[PDB]
């Protein structure tokens, strides 16, 4: 393979993966606290 | 890189933008209404 030496790639797979992991988590939490449904986090 | 003719890397990125768009947008949407700052929508 043939890219960059670093600091191309780290912050473009890091970036998206906090997108990702926030649409999920974010979503789902405030998907479920919707139903009014308390419980201890 | 070795894929499917079509129809493999469509859903891929589909999906994939989803999420990111829903973390950015929920997130901040999210993150906005918390400051309990009423506007006309």
Same mark, same amino acid.
């Given at each position: 393979?043939? #890219?960059?030496?670093?600091? =191309?790639?780290?912050?473009?797979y890091? $970036?998206?993966? %906090? %997108?990702?992991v926030?649409?999920?988590?974010?979503?789902?939490?405030? !998907? #479920?606290? =919707? $139903?009014s !449904?308390? =419980?201890?986090?």
């Amino acid at each position: 393979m043939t #890219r960059g030496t670093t600091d =191309n790639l780290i912050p473009v797979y890091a $970036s998206i993966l %906090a %997108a990702v992991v926030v649409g999920l988590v974010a979503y789902i939490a405030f !998907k #479920r606290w =919707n $139903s009014s !449904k308390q =419980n201890k986090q």
